[PDB]
């Protein structure tokens, strides 16, 4: 107390000793992550260019901006893992998971950057996209929100792990759904396949957060979690209807907003709480 | 003055933005690490037990203690990366390398613990081996040496990178040579195959340390590096002739002492300095 009460956070003089395994549930999530290892080199982009060039200009605009958003957001997720989560959490099984997640986020960032470099040849446009945190007001709201949680010296691990589940689970959900929308339309095989890998990885990353949450003795209140989650949904709904509207690829904004809320409900439930919005999933492809 | 003149250590606002690549040499080491990913599940141990049982008791003793040394040492290397190297280096290319190295060290530790668990069924013996830092004086000397460098709040990154190149390159060299000796004897294909993968990884991790050292503006003196490396050599020579003699598995202790010195000379050359001992490689199998 405050921390010596928490098995996840209290002193572990065996932290760097791997065996024997004591947290089998945490360990199997690490093994699952490890078994699904992939690299950017595994994704075949050799046919994407033609698909890309036949798209409408606003579809290229929407896609390049989603890609720049993802590449930037990964670095912030990664920053949080490197400076905070992988440091403060003391159980070996979670250290292994977070170590592997960092490696996977670097793979995700590389993948998104290779996609950008494959589709966009103009060095000026590349740089504008790589520096999205500074150049794109739309991503600003999300980037700064996630970044505040890293700098917050007061928020408990229980709060901050919820916040990053919202980052990986809510802030990403609209963009993931957008790319799945394009798969329904049979466009860019490289993009849509990499998208399946990455959204799978992200879902596992969120599931892990919920597992860590469950193992906490002192959890934040349902009310506190509600307001982090609701807040995140609002930022996400705004990003997708105002900052970078999904109409640009032919999607119904209203249904998108509904999906974001369905996602947050599923996360609230996976966190041991009650639904906030009580809406259905409008997308049968998700 | 002090660190804002070190490209590797100074402020990098782009540290979590992956592209574009600027340090192509550092980045290619990461790509090489990434392309050689493997898991413990890749290694078949089923043909080892029969050989294990054929050995003399002193040989099983030697091998299990080598395994316990390696398992314990990995977690110290890992501790250093998590708490120091991966935090203090600011260039993206190297952060990617070190992030991947952490993951691989966890795979190394797992491999070593699986080897122990596969060969040794006795629960009391397993626990004695897993707690080698506390239970085995042979490994305390090496563990304490490495651990002192993590706790050293004064020594430069330049000194510390050399020190951990000595850990992964000198403190491991005699043990790696031991296992290659067993291969030459046709024994335990599971163990010796895992040893091929791990010594290769460790060689790469040492190469990376030299690459980083070369990118440093304020290097420590050849004198100071000689002091660190000669010290590591004597500890390692003590380890393999006195604390856990290599005679136990049929090896000549004098030729082994000479091998350590040859490994150190190669490291000194790789760091941009001069040989220390000027002795040849006694082992045709290394
Ligand atoms: Fe290593
Ligand atoms: Mg442990
Ligand atoms: Mg960078």
UniProtKB/Swiss-Prot annotation, chains A, B:
Disulfide bonds: none annotated. One of its GO terms (molecular function) is ferric iron binding. Its EC number is 1.17.4.1. Its main location: cytoplasm. Fe cation 1 binds at residues 74, 105, 108. Belongs to the ribonucleoside diphosphate reductase small chain family. The lineage of its organism: Eukaryota, Metazoa, Chordata, Craniata, Vertebrata. One of its GO terms (cellular component) is ribonucleoside-diphosphate reductase complex. Induction: Up-regulated in response to DNA damage induced by doxorubicin, camptothecin, UV-C, methyl methanesulfonate, nocodazole, or gamma-irradiation. The keyword Nucleus applies. Provides the precursors necessary for DNA synthesis. Catalyzes the biosynthesis of deoxyribonucleotides from the corresponding ribonucleotides. Inhibits Wnt signaling. It comes from Homo sapiens (Human). It catalyses: a 2'-deoxyribonucleoside 5'-diphosphate + [thioredoxin]-disulfide + H2O = a ribonucleoside 5'-diphosphate + [thioredoxin]-dithiol. Ubiquitinated by the SCF(CCNF) E3 ubiquitin-protein ligase complex; leading to its degradation by the proteasome. Fe cation 2 binds at residues 105, 168, 202, 205. Two distinct regulatory sites have been defined: the specificity site, which controls substrate specificity, and the activity site which regulates overall catalytic activity. A substrate-binding catalytic site, located on M1, is formed only in the presence of the second subunit M2. Its cofactor is Fe cation. Transmembrane segments: none annotated. The chain holds residues 66 to 350 of 389 of the full protein. GO terms for biological process: 2'-deoxyribonucleotide biosynthetic process; blastocyst development; deoxyribonucleotide biosynthetic process; positive regulation of G1/S transition of mitotic cell cycle; protein heterotetramerization; ribonucleoside diphosphate metabolic process. It is found in: Cytoplasm; Nucleus. The active site is at residue 112. This is Ribonucleoside-diphosphate reductase subunit M2. Coiled coil: none annotated. It comes from the Eukaryota.
